Design a binder for this molecule. Structure first.
Ligand SMILES: CCCCCCCCCCCCCCCCCC(=O)OC[C@H](COP(=O)([O-])OCC(O)COP(=O)([O-])OC[C@@H](COC(=O)CCCCCCCCCCCCCCCCC)OC(=O)CCCCCCCCCCCCCCCCC)OC(=O)CCCCCCCCCCCCCCCCC
Ligand SMILES: CCCCCCCCCCCCCCCCCC(=O)OC[C@H](COP(=O)([O-])OCC(O)COP(=O)([O-])OC[C@@H](COC(=O)CCCCCCCCCCCCCCCCC)OC(=O)CCCCCCCCCCCCCCCCC)OC(=O)CCCCCCCCCCCCCCCCC
Ligand SMILES: CCCCCCCCCCCCCCCCCC(=O)OC[C@H](COP(=O)([O-])OCC(O)COP(=O)([O-])OC[C@@H](COC(=O)CCCCCCCCCCCCCCCCC)OC(=O)CCCCCCCCCCCCCCCCC)OC(=O)CCCCCCCCCCCCCCCCC
Ligand SMILES: CCCCCCCCCCCCCCCCCC(=O)OC[C@H](COP(=O)([O-])OCC[N+](C)(C)C)OC(=O)CCCCCCCCCCCCCCCCC
Ligand SMILES: NC(=O)C1=CN([C@@H]2O[C@H](COP(=O)(O)OP(=O)(O)OC[C@H]3O[C@@H](n4cnc5c(N)ncnc54)[C@H](OP(=O)(O)O)[C@@H]3O)[C@@H](O)[C@H]2O)C=CC1
Ligand code: SF4
Ligand code: SF4
Ligand code: SF4
Ligand SMILES: [Zn+2]
Lengths: 340, 118, 112, 161, 57, 63, 198, 92, 63, 193, 172
């Protein structure tokens, strides 16, 4: 090869040190963005965050500014996403490019879902192929990405994987399985839905779909380890949890940890699909959520696993029990539990 | 006498007044002034780096008190509010352009202050 | 200890509740009145007026030709660099330009 | 076609939030004293609608005006987290900006931006009440403009999509 | 400076209090935390029914 | 009353006592600065680089 | 010093077992007297000061320790006499000074107690003078002084869950820790500090 | 015109790499002051020793410095070491 | 750590630290520090005493 | 911004004189440009309006009136840009007028004639607060700076300048790669006579 | 006893009873007391290293009896179990087992009691007080760990592990 994938950086430093990593993280205004930036920025690395997020006063961009210290974290506002010049400027002085851009679950239009995933991934990969100083490109797709997937997000994520591998052959395609955390869309969504209905969680199937949740801290550690391994260049890594669970099992585990009795109110899948297709979709109500509820997102074993980049993920019961502290059921308790 | 924004002055000929003597750096109570000096090719003694951390500056006027050529001063400009901690990291470019912008009023005030014992 | 002097709050005016503070107030007013009288009698006040001639590259110790050429090289069209004035101000120690604030102090209106 | 409605309502919402900017009654030091001076008669924040609320729940602005110590950084982080959205942050003074006089101290955070995200910085030590009012007014203008900065592009019919 | 010479200050205050987000502390009872303000708003808007503006008006 | 004098302008003269009792020090401070005298420039350089040297000892001053 | 002055020699008259060493200076006030006091005879000395006529009208004005392990005469070394509190600083390793004011005698007293034991242990007069609570807490947290028989030993100005003695010549100004915000913890953590150097 | 780093150029320019353009100084020293002072011509003074204060009054410029215009080579320009002004004898 | 910061700086470079001790009374602390330095130097501020500036501004600070 | 001049303030010779002089647009926009008080539009006195003390390079007009009811309100500026109530700010006042408006001195800039301020060749025009704009102050090595790598290399080269290893095919004399020395200095002893 | 650890400084079980209708009682050993700590008097000076060691053991006993409450109220029960926290603090004490000055040991015991009270009364943050409970050579039990160093540096010496990592940044 003529494009060096070597990335010599010092990870033993702290916030005010220098690691030698100059990274541009596209699509960091979501959920995994702040954690990836913190993973890069907490070892003393320069991080740039391009964004076009509406309502620039949202906590997402502001917390993105907190990923690295002063003089190391920069935030590009009003990124065009259609300007090759802007893409070149975003990674002019960067040797790592991390593309977390993907169609949001709120989206249901295929053209917009195809736009974000395929178009932005292709443009980022092409920009990485024009700047010789870029060493690594880590592209984040989903686990159940396939051309036959009913979900436009998964279909266009498979297309984006193919486009990134074509444009930048030395890319690392991460396919995490149901990332969960504090600002996630899995445990936070479970809590908020159960609190809004107060009587049940809305299910649209038998909840037999397979899930392999992985912690966001584990995903960040996987990113760091992949940057520490040259064998990860141009390879597909599936980031799954230690075990595979159905949606019913995940509901049962969350209920047992929080103590809330699990009530699962069923709605016909066809009716749910109709109402989600024909109505406005937001974060908590979307055809993408329905379709992913009727899909399996686990490690299929067709590519390298999290064990290939050498991260031992924590168990989903452990992570969830860490993240459900204040939503615990207040049943009959010891008098010593009154003093908190 | 108002102590506003640190700025670098220049002679009426356009030559910068600072001679890179680091007296302001030694006299800065909060150590906000960092000076690195390399002689200019013509042979003069000038700063190649003159940085003032406006986040580490207590706006005390010791730099202009200790300056023997009245190069560093504190102009009246107090509307130096910035949206970035990096924007608050002043360098020689910013100090020189600020002194160029604010030289007339700075010159007037410094002239009046000089005429007090004179 | 055997004959204390107490200050007692009696009226609305703390100054009026003490003979010394009334005298202090009267002293302040008398000072204001006499300063006003002294300033009105003169009818004007000297003031410091800045001038660009203060900020030149050469002092009076240099010849008028050198001062003129240095000021013309730097393109200063505001300073007075005429050789006649420079020669008549060679090695002089005048204090500074001063203006006069002329009483009464009133607003400049536009009445039509 | 929903952009027909939201954009005028975007302007109305921005005007409403800038016209009732309520900062949290939380000060630490000489900067807090100057902040109090920025409220009283001579410089009236009530003219622009800036009235202080004692609890972070009722405050839109977190005005970090003073020195943040390692014994206080969790407190400032909790105060920022408990402030109801949308919220903005103004770091007043050299201590809040980057440590200031005590940047080389063992018990100073060396800037509140290390703990909470800062929206705007006022540099003085202490900033004059005029400087603080300038920072507040600039923040109000920015947050008025922040609701619609032109992120959405214009189609052939000049309606943002 | 809200409106011209501060004419629309109250409108701005009311609209801002509308726009301000609300989160219920997870250690608090959500039902009562939301219901008591609703009951207060219902009761405070029963004041104007007990008001005379003239003889039997 | 004078007509071309600061004494005419103002009654308070915050330098009359100092010029009355320490006229030598007053003249030395006014006329000599770090721009025309070598000793004053040396004092200025040592004052803003290392500072004034203080004799060893313990003091307690209360105000 | 043209005022009426008298040494507080009655203290050493009563205790009759202490080598009295007193200093006056024009660097101090004219009513200020410095006296050397042994560590063993400090609680008794303070009992006598608190409950004796012409001394009972006294208050504890100040209290602080000096880490004299690194005390060096930077200038005028040869001018050091044989009767100098500077010499007493030189020979020893720590010394706690207590400043009292006597209203009856209109006088200032400064007792110096010399510590050479490594643990820096000394009795606490917190149970005699109410000032000594927070003053001695500051002295203990900043200099590592072990105040035996103290009313309250908790720290006063130091950060929670931190054990250090910052006011020592060995301790650098920048310290050893810095508090940051950790996204993975969603809260403030403490890490090694890489501070700036001028 | 002469190539820098040569013996003659170094001996002339105080054993420093002379730059005619001075925009190299504009980059390195973050100021075009070298060009701005190169615009200023040479001042000719009759006396053997000239005095420079930087301006018109004391405290308005730099401390007084005395420049010797009576050099080994007649009419040799001498630069102020506080400002950038150059002085020389009237004739030689 | 104001005391340690003062101990790590010259006398004048640690003088502004006393402004922030009592930011309500920012000149009395300066006066106390200057009196301590003068007592260490064994002198007095004749100019400040004769100009009445210290007493006047300390009373303004008290107000 | 309706009723810039109140009716009671329009029943005043000042309003009619200003209307006859500057016209309706300029007369009405004055209450919007520098809204201070209802009775302070154009000056406190009613027989006339305050004469314009001076004009700014940015179109701002500066007035001084000694008849205001408080001493700290005698000098004011009316801005050219008055689009919103909270639009104008204190950073639009230039260098010359900043001191006059802040009562640092009684001198004010003049377009022509005798000047109270120096006018040197290196002076730059005043600019408002450029933060939160693309023209904000960028440190030479900040990530926002697109030429940061040059500055970082300049930093590193002062104490640890790296050795430029050969990059490509080179002449080999046995095991040694032959590349010419890149020293700008010339050893004249090797080239002499 | 007029102390924070006094037997009467217990939170009542009910609003009208201490424990029951026939007996009193309360829990201040494993949870916090009813009243805040106004004063924390000095440990009585120990003339013997024996007494210093007894003080150390009693302080460790008090800490161990209180660690489930600390884990529960600080939401760190998933990072380590109660026994894991006890073992980690035991390792912390073992690193200080070489102390031989009874006065210094008394000072350390006072500091440890103060820190334990700080963590007991929510004075200190959980992310800051967990450094004493954090494991030394093992990862935290609430997040995934990386064994890349263990695998790549298989059975290599600690010197080689430090050598391949480095002690300074490689860019400056
Ligand atoms: C094509 C033309 C249009 C057709 C459709 C027309 C629809 C008209 C009505 C509007 C309905 C909008 C959808 C429902 C609200 C969804 C809010 C939401 O997702 O909150 C996120 C919320 C989590 O966030 P949160 O912080 O807890 O609450 C934020 C909310 O904004 C907190 O807000 P809130 O909960 O206070 O306000 C919500 C409220 C707002 O709606 C109203 O106020 C409308 C008027 C209410 C009734 C009184 C007048 C009736 C007049 C006609 C008779 O809406 C409802 O209460 C929905 C109706 C009752 C649903 C249950 C019974 C059926 O909940 C979830 O994420 C759980 C899942 C949500 C599923 C939404 C889809 C199904 C909704 C039920 C059907
Ligand atoms: C002053 C005080 C402060 C201000 C107070 C204001 C109070 C009053 C506020 C009223 C707000 C009404 C919002 C109505 C939005 C709406 O339904 O738009 C429908 C529709 C949006 O359709 P679209 O943009 O084509 O979207 C299609 C999507 O691409 C593809 O479709 P999709 O499935 O993705 O979803 C499309 C559609 C949902 O559609 C559906 O679900 C079904 C229709 C589409 C699919 C059809 C499939 C086939 C049939 C299936 C059955 O989604 C929406 O409409 C989302 C609306 C979200 C909320 C927008 C407004 C929020 C701000 C205002 C609220 C109040 C703020 C108060 C602040 C505090 C004070 O808009 C129109 O039809 C606009 C027509 C043009 C006239 C507009 C102006 C009329 C009124 C003039 C006077 C206004 C006076 C001031 C008010
Ligand atoms: C309904 C609200 C109508 C007024 C707000 C109009 C909003 C708007 O377009 O603002 C853009 C822009 C922003 O104006 P601004 O000076 O920033 O503040 C708006 C105030 O309305 C500036 O105040 P103003 O001088 O325009 O107001 C005229 C004033 C006296 O005029 C009358 O009473 C008219 C008869 O009337 C009031 O003060 C009415 C107060 C109560 C309004 C209803 C509250 C519910 O306003 C205009 O271009 C002129 C609007 C003229 C409206 C009449
Ligand atoms: C905690 C109670 C302390 C003593 C309270 C003594 C009376 C106080 C009266 C003042 C107002 C109190 C709050 C009123 C609103 C909540 C009602 C309530 O308690 O519901 C409990 C009931 C029962 O609550 P629940 O569901 O939690 O109880 C189930 C029983 N447990 C949990 C014990 C197993 O709530 C409901 O039924 C909820 C739905 C209906 C809500 C109806 C009220 C909503 C507000 C409407 C306006 C009210 C004011 C109208 C004014 C008219 C003009 C004067
Ligand atoms: N979270 C999970 O459980 C999993 C996520 N993934 C994928 O990993 C990636 C990172 O995760 P996550 O943070 O949760 O993702 P999110 O869905 O929460 O965030 C998507 C990001 O892409 C941006 N974006 C979306 N649409 C567009 C568009 N049309 N043009 C430009 N930018 C756009 C968003 O910015 P803006 O705010 O402007 O819309 C945001 O920064 C995503 O691609 C996600 O789908 C994969 C497996 C599991
Ligand atoms: S004003 Fe004081 S703190 Fe600020 S740069 Fe100048 S000397 Fe340093
Ligand atoms: S004191 Fe003045 S001349 Fe000396 S280095 Fe500082 S700015 Fe330059
Ligand atoms: S920045 Fe200056 S004025 Fe503000 S708190 Fe710190 S020391 Fe006080
Ligand atoms: Zn000169």
């Amino acid at each position: 090869q003529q494009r060096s994938t070597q990335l010599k950086f010092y990870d033993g430093g702290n916030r005010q040190s220098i690691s030698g990593i100059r990274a541009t993280i596209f699509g960091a205004t979501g959920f995994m963005g702040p954690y990836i930036g913190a993973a890069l920025g907490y070892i003393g690395s320069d991080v740039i965050f391009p964004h076009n997020h509406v309502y620039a006063y949202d906590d997402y961009v502001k917390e993105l500014k907190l990923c690295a210290g002063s003089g190391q974290s920069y935030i590009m506002r009003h990124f065009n996403y259609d300007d090759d010049n802007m893409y070149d400027m975003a990674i002019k002085n960067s040797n790592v490019v991390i593309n977390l851009v993907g169609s949001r679950l709120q989206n249901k239009n295929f053209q917009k879902a195809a736009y974000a995933n395929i178009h932005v991934a292709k443009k980022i990969a092409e920009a990485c192929a024009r700047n010789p100083n870029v060493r690594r490109l880590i592209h984040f797709s989903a686990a159940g990405a396939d051309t036959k997937s009913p979900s436009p997000d998964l279909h266009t994520k498979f297309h984006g994987e193919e486009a990134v591998l074509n444009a930048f052959p030395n890319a690392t395609i991460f396919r995490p399985c149901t990332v969960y955390g504090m600002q996630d869309y899995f445990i936070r969504h479970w809590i908020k839905e159960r609190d809004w209905w107060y009587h049940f969680n809305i299910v649209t199937d038998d909840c037999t779909a397979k899930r392999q949740p992985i912690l966001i801290n584990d995903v960040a550690q996987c990113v760091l380890n992949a940057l520490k391994l040259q064998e990860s260049a141009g390879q597909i890594y599936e980031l799954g949890g230690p075990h595979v669970y159905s949606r019913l099992e995940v509901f049962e585990m969350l209920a047992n940890l929080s103590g809330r009795p699990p009530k699962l109110a069923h709605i016909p899948h066809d009716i749910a699909l109709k109402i989600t297709q024909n109505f406005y979709n937001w974060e908590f109500f979307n055809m993408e959520k329905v379709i992913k509820d009727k899909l399996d997102l686990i490690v299929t074993g067709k590519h390298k696993t999290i064990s290939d980049l050498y991260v031992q993920p924590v168990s989903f019961p452990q992570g969830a029990e860490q993240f459900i502290d204040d939503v615990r059921y207040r049943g009959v308790e010891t008098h010593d539990n009154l003093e908190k | 006498l108002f102590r506003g924004e640190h700025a670098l002055r220049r002679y009426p000929t356009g030559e910068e007044r600072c001679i890179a003597c680091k007296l302001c750096q030694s006299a800065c109570p909060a150590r906000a002034i960092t000076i690195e000096t390399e002689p200019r090719p013509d042979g003069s003694r000038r700063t190649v780096r003159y940085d003032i951390d406006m986040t580490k500056c207590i706006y005390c006027g010791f730099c202009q008190e200790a300056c023997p050529v009245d190069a560093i001063v504190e102009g009246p400009n107090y509307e130096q509010t910035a949206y970035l901690h990096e924007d608050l990291f002043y360098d020689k470019y910013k100090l020189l352009e600020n002194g160029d912008k604010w030289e007339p009023q700075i010159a007037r005030n410094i002239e009046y202050l000089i005429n007090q014992p004179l | 200890k055997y004959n204390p002097e107490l200050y007692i709050y009696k009226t609305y005016d703390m100054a009026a509740d003490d003979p010394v503070w009334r005298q202090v107030k009267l002293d302040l007013e008398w000072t204001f009145e006499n300063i006003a009288e002294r300033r009105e009698s003169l009818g004007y006040m000297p003031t410091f007026k800045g001038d660009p001639n203060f900020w030149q590259a050469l002092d009076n110790s240099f010849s008028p030709e050198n001062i003129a050429q240095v000021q013309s090289s730097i393109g200063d069209k505001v300073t007075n660099i005429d050789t006649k004035a420079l020669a008549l101000n060679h090695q002089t120690e005048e204090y500074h330009k001063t203006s006069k604030l002329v009483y009464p102090i009133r607003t400049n209106l536009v009445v039509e | 076609r929903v952009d027909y409605i939201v954009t005028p309502i975007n302007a109305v919402v921005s005007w409403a939030r800038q016209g009732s900017f309520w900062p949290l009654t939380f000060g630490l030091a000489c900067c807090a004293v100057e902040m109090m001076h920025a409220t009283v008669s001579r410089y009236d924040f009530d003219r622009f609608g800036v009235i202080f609320r004692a609890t972070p729940r009722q405050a839109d602005l977190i005005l970090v005006a003073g020195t943040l110590t390692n014994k206080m950084a969790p407190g400032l982080r909790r105060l920022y987290e408990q402030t109801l959205d949308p919220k903005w942050v103004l770091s007043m003074g050299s201590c809040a900006n980057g440590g200031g006089y005590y940047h080389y101290s063992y018990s100073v955070v060396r800037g509140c931006n290390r703990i909470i995200p800062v929206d705007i910085y006022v540099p003085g030590c202490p900033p004059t009440a005029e400087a603080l009012m300038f920072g507040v007014l600039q923040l109000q203008k920015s947050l008025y403009r922040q609701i619609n900065e032109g992120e959405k592009k214009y189609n052939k019919k000049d309606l943002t999509y | 400076y809200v409106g011209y010479r501060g004419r629309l200050q109250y409108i701005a205050d009311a609209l801002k209090l509308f726009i301000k987000g609300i989160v219920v502390p997870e250690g608090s009872n959500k039902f009562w935390f939301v219901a008591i303000p609703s009951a207060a708003g219902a009761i405070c808007y029963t004041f104007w029914i007990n008001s005379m503006w003239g003889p039997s008006v | 009353l004078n007509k071309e004098n600061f004494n005419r302008q103002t009654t308070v003269l915050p330098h009359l006592v100092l010029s009355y009792l320490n006229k030598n020090d007053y003249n030395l401070k006014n006329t000599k600065n770090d721009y025309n005298s070598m000793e004053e420039l040396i004092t200025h350089f040592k004052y803003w680089s290392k500072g004034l040297k203080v004799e060893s000892g313990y003091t307690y001053q209360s105000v | 010093m043209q005022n009426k002055y008298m040494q507080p020699i009655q203290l050493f008259i009563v205790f009759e077992k202490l080598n009295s060493k007193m200093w006056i200076s024009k660097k101090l006030n004219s009513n200020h007297s410095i006296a050397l006091i042994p560590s063993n005879w400090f609680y008794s000395i303070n009992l006598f000061l608190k409950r004796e006529l012409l001394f009972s009208n006294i208050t504890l004005i100040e209290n602080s320790a000096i880490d004299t392990i690194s005390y060096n005469l930077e200038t005028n070394q040869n001018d050091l006499d044989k009767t100098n509190i500077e010499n007493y600083f030189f020979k020893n390793k720590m010394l706690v000074f207590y400043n009292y004011y006597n209203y009856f005698l209109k006088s200032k007293l400064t007792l110096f107690i010399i510590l050479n034991n490594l643990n820096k242990s000394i009795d606490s007069i917190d149970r005699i003078f109410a000032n000594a609570n927070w003053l001695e807490r500051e002295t203990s947290e900043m200099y590592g002084i072990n105040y035996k028989w103290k009313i309250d030993t908790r720290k006063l100005l130091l950060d929670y869950s931190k054990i250090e003695n910052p006011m020592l010549k060995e301790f650098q100004s920048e310290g050893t820790q810095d508090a940051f915000y950790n996204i993975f913890e969603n809260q403030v953590v403490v890490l090694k500090n890489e501070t700036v150097e001028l | 015109n002469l190539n820098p780093y040569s013996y003659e150029a170094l001996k002339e320019n105080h054993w420093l790499v002379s730059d005619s353009s001075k925009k190299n100084s504009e980059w390195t020293h973050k100021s075009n002051a070298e060009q701005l002072i190169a615009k200023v011509p040479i001042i000719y003074v009759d006396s053997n020793i000239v005095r420079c204060i930087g301006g018109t009054e004391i405290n308005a410029g730099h401390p007084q410095v005395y420049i010797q215009l009576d050099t080994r080579k007649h009419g040799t320009p001498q630069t102020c070491k506080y400002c950038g002004l150059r002085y020389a004898k009237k004739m030689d | 750590g104001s005391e340690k910061l003062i101990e790590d700086r010259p006398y004048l470079q640690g003088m502004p630290y006393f402004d922030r001790f009592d930011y309500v009374s920012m000149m009395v602390q300066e006066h106390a520090y200057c009196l301590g330095i003068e007592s260490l130097l064994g002198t007095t501020n004749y100019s400040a005493t004769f100009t009445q500036i210290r007493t006047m501004y300390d009373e303004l600070t008290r107000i | 911004g309706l009723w810039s001049w109140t009716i009671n303030q329009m029943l005043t010779p000042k309003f009619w004189v200003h209307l006859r002089r500057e016209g309706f647009i300029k007369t009405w926009t004055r209450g919007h440009k520098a809204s201070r008080h209802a009775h302070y539009v154009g000056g406190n006195r009613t027989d006339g309006y305050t004469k314009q003390v001076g004009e700014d390079e940015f179109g701002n007009r500066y007035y001084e009136d000694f008849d205001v009811d408080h001493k700290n309100q005698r000098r004011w500026v009316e801005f050219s840009d008055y689009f919103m109530q909270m639009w104008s700010n204190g950073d639009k006042v230039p260098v010359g007028w900043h001191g006059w408006l802040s009562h640092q001195y009684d001198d004010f800039p003049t377009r022509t004639g005798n000047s109270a301020f120096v006018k040197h060749h290196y002076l730059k025009q005043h600019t408002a607060n450029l933060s939160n704009t693309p023209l904000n102050h960028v440190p030479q090595g900040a990530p926002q700076n697109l030429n940061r790598m040059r500055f970082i290399t300049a930093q590193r080269d002062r104490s640890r300048a790296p050795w430029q290893s050969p990059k490509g095919e080179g002449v080999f004399q046995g095991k040694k790669l032959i590349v010419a020395s890149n020293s700008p200095f010339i050893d004249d002893m090797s080239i002499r006579d | 006893m007029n102390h924070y650890w006094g037997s009467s400084n217990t939170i009542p079980a009910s609003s009208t009873q201490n424990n029951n209708y026939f007996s009193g009682g309360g829990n201040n050993v494993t949870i916090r007391g009813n009243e805040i700590m106004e004063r924390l008097p000095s440990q009585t000076p120990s003339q013997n290293m024996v007494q210093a060691s007894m003080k150390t053991l009693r302080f460790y006993r008090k800490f161990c009896r209180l660690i489930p409450f600390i884990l529960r109220i600080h939401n760190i029960g998933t990072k380590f179990t109660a026994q894991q926290a006890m073992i980690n603090f035991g390792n912390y004490i073992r690193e200080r087992n070489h102390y031989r000055d009874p006065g210094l040991i008394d000072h350390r015991i006072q500091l440890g009691y103060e820190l334990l009270y700080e963590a007991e009364m929510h004075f200190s943050q959980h992310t800051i007080l967990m450094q004493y409970l954090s494991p030394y050579n093992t990862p935290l039990s609430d997040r995934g760990y990386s064994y890349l160093e263990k695998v790549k540096y298989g059975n290599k010496s600690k010197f080689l592990q430090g050598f391949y990592k480095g002690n300074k940044p490689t860019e400056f």
